[PDB]
Design a protein around this ligand. Structure first.
Ligand SMILES: O=C1Cc2cc(Nc3ncncc3Cl)ccc2N1
Ligand SMILES: O=C1Cc2cc(Nc3ncncc3Cl)ccc2N1
Ligand SMILES: [Cl-]
Ligand SMILES: [Cl-]
Lengths: 4, 124, 124, 4
């Protein structure tokens, strides 16, 4: 999971 | 927004759509190419091809279970492109590049047309 | 094999599937949650959820145009997860994390369950 | 395009  | 994003989600979805295709699950159309038949999902074909997008948004054609491609279309070229649609992988070779590019132009798959044009230009 | 791969293909396919969902094109099922209705594509739901995979591979249920979820399922939690399925983006907030995790457990969306568990553990 |  990432900060888009 | 303040969303988080799962990096591998799109790839995992496409992998699962290809597993459904392999097992012939929920396929809703047959594409006929020079008497060679390919089963697929209309939505995946639309998502990958400007031609299928136009065909399945047509009020009459959206309801067809069989689509016949132009007789000049090569079944191997189509098969390679169908595989690309469901995997992101293009089996491009010296022996098939002309058929693949001609099929990609007809199907309106601009990124495939682009790499074929570049690979052909490199060999001249 | 000796394939080349188009990096953005899977993401572009999912973006196009979400555009079809927005325009209600080729949607083939309604998911009913506490009298809230959500239109979707069976194949995308199957590709994202172990629950929908099991439902639409069932010989009788594969033919249903309406699926009713368990009444304990929260419509907002479902909406957030449906959006995630079609975009890879999860709108996870302090105010919805419990409903989102409970819905992801029911839908069998293991990666979502994992990030909810981690975000909850960080706040304790 | 890349070599996967
Ligand atoms: O090269 C290409 C690939 C491609 C895909 C589509 N598909 C869609 N476009 C927009 N909204 C939904 C969909 Cl399904 C249309 C044109 C082209 N041209
Ligand atoms: O967490 C998850 C996400 C998910 C998706 C599916 N889908 C499929 N699995 C295998 N072949 C085809 C499909 Cl469509 C099954 C289980 C789970 N569990
Ligand atoms: Cl393309
Ligand atoms: Cl997930």
């Amino acid at each position: 999971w990432v900060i888009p | 927004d303040s969303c988080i994003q799962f990096t591998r989600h799109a790839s995992d979805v496409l992998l699962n759509l290809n597993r459904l295709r392999s097992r012939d699950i929920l396929t809703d159309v047959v594409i006929v190419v020079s008497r060679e038949q390919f089963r697929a999902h209309k939505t995946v074909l639309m998502a990958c091809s400007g031609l299928f997008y136009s065909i399945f948004t047509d009020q009459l054609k959206c309801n067809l279970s069989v689509i016949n491609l132009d007789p000049e279309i090569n079944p191997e070229g189509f098969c390679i492109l169908l595989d690309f649609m469901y995997t992101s992988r293009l089996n491009l070779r010296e022996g098939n590049i002309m058929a693949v590019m001609a099929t990609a132009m007809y199907l309106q798959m601009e990124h495939v047309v682009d790499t074929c044009r570049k690979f052909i230009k490199a060999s001249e």
